[PDB]
């Protein structure tokens, strides 16, 4: 009965399971889970920079200056934008916003605006500029989008309205304007005196015109009329010209793009909490060094890669085999 040497292998108390091609649910001595499945349930600052929290406002409500959005009249640099699925405060005077999704897509690469008073209201000397609507009422009185100017008849006249701005701000500038489509003729006359009007906008590359449409529509926020808004990115050193015999909704401001970068609009009903992260999802923030996550496909920041998997566990050790 001689001396012996035996060759063998490690076993421990591990109950870590992995799958293979030939066999599922294999117990191994060591394993590496490579899938992050948890998040903190909060909306957070991203690298110290807070999102822009729109609250009840839509992108349109913000940029037009819906008076219910006044907290947003001046905002600092943001890391992402939080918008609700169906914000209440958008076009308070009802209507439409041309190429609105394209504008929202622009916002994914913008991180700050400087709002510039490009066409000061006081300079419309031949027109009334105090026009508002019960649809945008403030403290029980008719009012209007803060960033826009409703030009109307003055002394029963509406001379040709012309305004011009040369973008000397040093960056591309977002400019919005509108055309009022009245409910009826009494409205067209009381507001603009003229009939058969138009609104013309021209830059070096854009030539866009509207003739207003008088037509009976269902009331929205109490109004049968509509304001159709449009926008352009005015290049540096380019000039925008407005010209109108009536129905023009003029911008008073332009939004100079003051910071560019990777950003985005996150759809959420939640509110910003006092927390910090490198990777934000609509469900909450992720803090992991794992290469994959399965939390949500729409993330912002420095994020793991998303997969639909319920589990991803790599075997590192060997099959954990019970003692003899």
């Amino acid at each position: 009965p001689g001396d012996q040497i035996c060759i063998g292998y490690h076993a421990n108390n591990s109950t870590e399971k992995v799958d293979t091609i030939l066999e599922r649910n294999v117990t191994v001595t060591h394993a590496k889970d490579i899938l992050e499945k948890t998040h903190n349930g909060k909306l957070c600052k991203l690298n110290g920079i807070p999102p822009l929290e729109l609250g009840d406002c839509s992108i349109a409500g913000w940029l037009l200056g819906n008076p219910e959005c006044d907290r947003l009249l001046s905002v600092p640099e943001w890391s992402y934008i939080m918008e609700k699925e169906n914000p209440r405060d958008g076009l308070c005077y009802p209507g439409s916003f041309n190429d609105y999704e394209e504008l929202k897509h622009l916002l994914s690469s913008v991180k700050h605006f400087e709002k510039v008073k490009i066409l000061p209201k006081d300079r419309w000397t031949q027109h009334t500029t105090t026009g508002g609507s019960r649809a945008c009422a403030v403290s029980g009185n008719p009012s209007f989008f803060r960033n826009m100017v409703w030009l109307t008849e003055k002394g029963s006249n509406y001379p040709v309205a012309k305004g011009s701005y040369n973008n000397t701000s040093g960056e591309q500038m977002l400019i919005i304007w509108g055309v009022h489509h009245p409910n009826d003729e009494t409205e067209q006359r009381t507001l603009y005196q003229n009939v058969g009007t138009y609104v013309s906008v021209g830059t070096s590359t854009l030539n866009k015109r509207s003739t207003p449409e008088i037509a009976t529509r269902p009331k929205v926020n109490g109004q049968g009329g509509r304001m159709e808004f449009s926008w352009t990115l005015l290049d540096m050193w380019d000039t925008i010209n407005f010209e109108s015999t009536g129905n023009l909704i003029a911008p008073e401001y332009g939004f100079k793009i003051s910071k560019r970068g990777s950003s985005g609009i996150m759809k959420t009903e939640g509110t910003l909490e006092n927390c910090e992260t490198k990777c934000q999802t609509p469900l909450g923030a992720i803090n992991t060094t794992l290469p994959f996550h399965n939390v949500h496909p729409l993330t912002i920041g420095e994020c793991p890669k998303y997969v639909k998997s319920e589990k991803l566990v790599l075997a590192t050790g060997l099959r954990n085999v019970p003692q003899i």
Binding site: G2, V28, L314
Partner: protein
Amino acid sequence: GLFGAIAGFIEGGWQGMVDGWYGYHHSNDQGSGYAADKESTQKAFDGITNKVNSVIEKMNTQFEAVGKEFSNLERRLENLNKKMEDGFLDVWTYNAELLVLMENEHTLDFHDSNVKNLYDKVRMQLRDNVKELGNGCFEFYHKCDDECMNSVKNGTYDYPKYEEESKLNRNE
């Protein structure tokens, strides 16, 4: 498994060998005990470390979903965007899940090869100075003290040194 050693001719693992993946149990006049084989364990550790890095590094550029919006007159474009973002998502889920099943299979077989290889290394060195018991153990035909055991464990067992003694013992 593929190489027949783990859960194979070596029937079970050793709870008492806590300092590596593969190794030895010896038994002589001086007593008995476990010891890890440092070289085979280190090689396996470096291999496995590289593998996990490689799987990870190969999926550092995968698809990322970008939030976009579409009007009610842009349903075809919306569905195209959806099908696309979904499509890449499904491709990467499959890639990650497959790569992991395939590499898990190979990892388990790699450990099995490493054990078989260590066994064969020892066997091919001891030659007929030992009985091959069939359970991963070798029974010596010559007394093999602690220092002799250490020569086996570091690959410097001296066959000629013990040839004469073993042959006599094997025969009487």
